[PDB]
Write a protein that binds this ligand. Sequence first.
Ligand SMILES: Nc1ncnc2c1ncn2[C@@H]1O[C@H](COP(=O)(O)OP(=O)(O)OP(=O)(O)O)[C@@H](O)[C@H]1O
Ligand SMILES: Nc1ncnc2c1ncn2[C@@H]1O[C@H](COP(=O)(O)OP(=O)(O)O)[C@@H](O)[C@H]1O
Ligand SMILES: [Mg+2]
Ligand SMILES: [Mg+2]
Lengths: 532, 106, 29
Amino acid sequence: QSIINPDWNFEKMGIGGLDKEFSDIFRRAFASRVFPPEIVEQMGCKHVKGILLYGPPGCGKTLLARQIGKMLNAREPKVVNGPEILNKYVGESEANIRKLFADAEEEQRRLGANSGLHIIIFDEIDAICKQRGGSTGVHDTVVNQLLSKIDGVEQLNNILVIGMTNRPDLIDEALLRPGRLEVKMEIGLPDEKGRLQILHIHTARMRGHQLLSADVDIKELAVETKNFSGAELEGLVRAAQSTAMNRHIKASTKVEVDMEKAESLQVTRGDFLASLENDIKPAFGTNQEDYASYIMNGIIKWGDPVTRVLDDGELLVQQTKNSDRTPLVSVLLEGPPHSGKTALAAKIAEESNFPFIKICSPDKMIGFSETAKCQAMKKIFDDAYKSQLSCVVVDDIERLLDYVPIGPRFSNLVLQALLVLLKKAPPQGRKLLIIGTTSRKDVLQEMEMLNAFSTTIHVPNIATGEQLLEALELLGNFKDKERTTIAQQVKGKKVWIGIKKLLMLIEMSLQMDPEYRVRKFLALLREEGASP
Amino acid sequence: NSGLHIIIFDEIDAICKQRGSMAGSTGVHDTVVNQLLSKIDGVEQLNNILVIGMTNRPDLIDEALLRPGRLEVKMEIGLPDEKGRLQILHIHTARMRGHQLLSADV
Amino acid sequence: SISKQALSEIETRHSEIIKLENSIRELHD
Ligand SMILES: Nc1ncnc2c1ncn2[C@@H]1O[C@H](COP(=O)(O)OP(=O)(O)OP(=O)(O)O)[C@@H](O)[C@H]1O
Ligand SMILES: Nc1ncnc2c1ncn2[C@@H]1O[C@H](COP(=O)(O)OP(=O)(O)O)[C@@H](O)[C@H]1O
Ligand SMILES: [Mg+2]
Ligand SMILES: [Mg+2]
């Protein structure tokens, strides 16, 4: 008298992090299959016949389904590996769909209220069971042939279907109604305790044979890895093992010397800490490569107007991290061309210590049509809702809309997508922060895009001789005599020059012979002069 | 116990639901890529394959095809330099040398 | 639109029989 395996326990299941979801799934889908049959039959109830698991990809959805399958005293589970049923001839997909349920019907007709459970695991239910609408080809027929089997004129009572998908809203609505796939669970990214348990599960075996050094710690690794997804944790452990093993392929077995040195192999903290920086790069985490590409030549301090901007950025970050009545915040950086607004946004973003940071620039969308840009922006904004903190940077706003002064001309659709997105708070609890960057504030003011933003900041140019001299001194060019001559010539008047244009005039002037350098630099600076 | 079964693809970027984002329409109904993924790793496990992919347009490669457990080691084969050209010229000219067909002037 | 499906037809080969029975039965008799 048992429907479950006589011997089992959860601690052997190999799953770690998903505790409450498993408890709820058991309560719903297994409460009425483990009570004594007499009471259940007296009640006159019917068992649940569906489960739908959805969430971010790579967090252990397939594993839970396979382990629920290998759980029971049920026969071995069948599998429909996604698009394995499609065919070219007329009326062949339906044969494939109908072939699955044959054994269940046979047993139900042969026995009654006594047969053994049958489990069908359906991978990527989204691939085929799309909305039933125009024609879609084979989609409309397969969906009907499926909906007409789980609950039809004839009654089945010994079946249970599991459906896995990462996008939940593209499944036909009818399918997801009480009576067919009913209980739907979400598996998300794990927090600290989940990472601790996963690392223990994946390191126990090494620990068993003493192969693990005493220097390594697991709590520190759990703390330092944030927004890692399980698969990435396994990858990290494998990378550590491979690095440790390769540490010996050049010392002991390379020279074919006594393996005792090779047999003293032991993975240590060095392997992990040197493998956390050059092998694994999360998909929902900070990526320390772009910031080294945007702030090309550092952030020098040419005067006051840098400190104020940085302080304001810090204040905005601090506000967005510790407030409950204001989850969504925004800010706009603006100024004249060639002033530095993509090298002061990156710094503010990178000095926040948020677990998620992303930059969406127009440089990686050359040739795209409008809908491609819309779906790129929406995809980047989808991720930030799946982490408990974030910062998304929108760079060069005026090149996204495809602006051009003649006309004027621009893309309406991108503007509407942007205006709707700048006023959408994330699901309950989470936070956000958005930074912009533009050079034509007024044209933005015309389109009514300064109502969405909650503040603005101003980045100025070099506007006095002293600041130019300080910038030249810090950059490290020209000598004492040349410095003195430049100071005496340029002190009287005033200058108005950006800070990404000075780095070009310096180079253009540093290409003549030593005698004419200062003269050419002064001529170039004078010619490229103007006033507000 | 079975040994490796290495499979060499070619122009693997031809099948990817990423080239359709650009101006044009060729997504091969995207189902192609699905199938391939489900075979490398998935519900049913395999422990003898060394799929090697090679392509000329790295930017059109799908994103779901590079997570750990799947194709997960990238590499770049750059053009040769003086030494490489010298070596590759020597290799393709060893036959003639042995038979003294090649003149001494060259 | 790309989804194009197809129907099909079949043939047969056929063999010889009808009077071999008579010869076999006559031999046995
Ligand atoms: N205090 C500073 N503020 C801004 N940029 C600085 C500063 N000190 C040095 N830089 C250099 O200024 C350069 C600014 O380049 P960047 O492309 O961001 O210019 P920009 O004028 O903001 O650009 P865009 O015209 O595209 O809006 C960077 O290379 C950075 O190294
Ligand atoms: N909760 C978890 N605990 C331990 N390992 C996990 C967990 N979730 C996922 N993994 C690891 O991820 C790998 C693959 O997961 P997979 O079943 O492909 O998830 P999905 O199909 O949802 O992407 C497994 O080898 C497993 O070791
Ligand atoms: Mg810019
Ligand atoms: Mg899978």
